[model samples]
Target: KPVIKMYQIGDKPDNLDELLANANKIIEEKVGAKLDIQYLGWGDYGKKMSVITSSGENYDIAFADNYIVNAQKGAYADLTELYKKEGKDLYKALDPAYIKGNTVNGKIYAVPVAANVASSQNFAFNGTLLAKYGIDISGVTSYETLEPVLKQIKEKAPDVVPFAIGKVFIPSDNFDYPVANGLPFVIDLEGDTTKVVNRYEVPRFKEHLKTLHKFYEAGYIPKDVATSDTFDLQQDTWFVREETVGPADYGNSLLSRVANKDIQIKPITNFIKKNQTTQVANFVISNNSKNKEKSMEILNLLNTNPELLNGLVYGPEGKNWEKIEGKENRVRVLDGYKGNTHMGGWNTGNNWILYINENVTDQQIENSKKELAEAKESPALGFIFNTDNVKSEISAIANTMQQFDTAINTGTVDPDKAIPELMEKLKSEGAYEKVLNEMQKQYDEFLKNKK
Candidate 1:
């Protein structure tokens, strides 16, 4: 009845008009809603979305993060009841746990993007160094066990870093974050899944930082790593760092490709859920829209109908993309538009239903989907803390954490001393009593509701 205006992020697809012409025709015939899709470039979305929503623009749907920042501002329509009433097919197309994963305060503001639902803890080491030093790492299971390896690397090559990590380093399995933005509170999935605590207060975290002290003094890490950004996998500057991969441990090959070198990765723990899996771009109906119901109907069709998703995301069958004759659900880019798919990555629904290209095998596609099917989802996967109630406290805690996150994580300072200092700063900033106290209240209710 009305045009469903949608905003997605990516370079404007050159063939947009041609593809949407066919996509809209099919959709209008089936669902009675015309389509008016728009594109915002990757870097432009975050700022523009804030403006559009704050100004209460009249669009039907826009791509959003599952952060609840917009949801808090009343920029999004709560889709909880909408899913049960109008979105059964959409709900069916996604993993039930994924829907829960996206929920905050018992409301669904966006349909969460399904990336890999689970990933495993890992240590990716430079194969060339391991071979050169003759260190057998098969027996190393924990970060502490790798101390001797780091020692060996430092003593011999002194020029190379034994371990290099990101500016903000939390190994996926180390702490299951309630929110993705390096928040002060977390659930120790292995120790206490239900109890949310200050991230730095945990024994597991304390012990790891103590061990990192050894790597630090031994000159195994870069001195200036505190302010350094996430170490580039493409740069051959570091020896080993923590990472996460698909449930099948599918990262070794992917990292190897990026670095163009011999890299070996081993899982340090079993499969675990990270907030990132369901925290990608999602589509939310605008609170100001006149077509909220129709927008969701189109969203349902996007996830449930492969033909519509394929045409909208991949483009016209022969002119831009086509099916590979011998492959199942695989596609071939017929022409030279080799940048990205029609909707762009993480821009829309059910990535598993989209076509695979020539560079990757069908096995690669399965690797991404298998985790969603097989991994036992952690209880904390679904709990997203809304910071609305404690904005001032969170702001203070964020400022405090930023002062110490990189130094302690990258082994640039003695955690024994730095941690105490860090905690004291966090205390003054109202991290424990104000921020974490509120987080615990929400988290406990989320657990209690799960029953």
Candidate 2:
């Protein structure tokens, strides 16, 4: 294995100390190296990642954002050559779909940390709570039908919110509704398979907006939801408290709170019937790395070696966690690393699928496979937009949308006034048409070829 040094970063996971120890052992063995890492906060984190890339820092492996941070910047390397030269075994081990999501222009930019669309904008319900109260949510389909269930749950349960929402500053989009960074919304359905209409311009966009407004009006969501953050919403409402059950979304914010809970989240994607989408979360090597061999080796170990992946995500096997049974599946952490001190920092390009929960049973494995099979790949699934062409206009509209998005969609501002203005701003952005054209072209090509 080639020797390497890497920098993996995120909003900090619950088991940082254990994560480092695990990383030290694996990198030392697999790549014949070690990493110099940093865990930056979400606030102003973008600036820090940018500074690192632009400054041409000496880090060899950087966990970067293909969506935000320019992957072409310093300290990055394309994995195509590395994979071809000596990384083919690790390359072949990954699902093509996962690999393609991170590729751009027939070149590998990243490998997936995990193919984790499972958590993408899912609607989760506490199954035990539902059973305890005899609440049958399976029959509840469509936002129209689901409304009453929320009302009933709030009325009957008395302690929980019908929907627990995490309030984050990054909500607005060129589309309407709070579209999660990479999940499908109603905008995804208004057009042909390849081209999704902008939510701000869609009729359903207004309807969904009204729906959120209704939630606020009916007291289904928290009164201060727009102001309160997601972690507070998770700890104060969901977790053991089980306050509301609308959207069970989580990130590093609630990574600690939900760590060892026996509560099973009734995922929202399962309820979606048409044009369903799985999020595309991928990892890309930076263009600046001098140790491409070393970086790919780290990726190889992270993706292929279960022990390395677990250490990065959960911690050292015996000390910080324990394995259960079957497929050598694991249950991580003792007690201390659940909520506060966990500091796992491997969310970047080289290694993606880092979680090591047990695939302990045949039934569980089947459930996982079925979930993967049921997910409808985007018509333009592997098409990565060259947004740099429209970067200026996109940046301007992105800023404007953030200011008025929730206000209008949530009905705090008049839709009559805001919607029209928002649509005009989007048109001015120019990239809207470019994205539509790119998606349509890619989709048509897929239909003609991707059987």
How do all models score by TM-score? 0.81, 0.74
Per-residue lDDT for 117-226 in model 2, tens only? Answer: 33233344554456667776666434445577788777777677666654442222222121223322233533444455666556655666666667667877667766
lDDT of every predicted structure (CA atoms): 0.72, 0.51
Candidate 2 has a TM-score of 0.74
lDDT of 1: 0.72
lDDT of 1 by residue, 1-451 (tens): 6888988776777878877888887789878998888887778688877777778577888888435566766678888878886777777677666776677666778876555566777889988777888877887788788887788777777777778865666534456765767575777777777788776678877777777777667677666666666567666567888777763234565566556677788777666655666666678888899988888888888877788888876676776687878887777776544434366535666666766665554565575556556777677777667777888877777777787787777667777888899888767644457777788888888789869
Candidate 2 regions exceeding 4 Å error are 1-3, 11-26, 29-31, 67-69, 72-75, 117-120, 126-133, 157-160, 166-190, 230-286, 325-327, 330-333, 336-362, 411-421, 424-451
Model 1: pairs clashing at backbone N, Cα or C within 3 Å = none
> RMSD to native for every prediction?
4.0, 5.8
- In angstroms, give how far residue 193 of model 1 lies from its true place: 2.8
Candidate 1 regions exceeding 4 Å error are 10-34, 72-74, 80-86, 125-137, 146-162, 230-241, 247-264, 274-276, 310-322, 331-343, 357-370, 384-389, 428-431
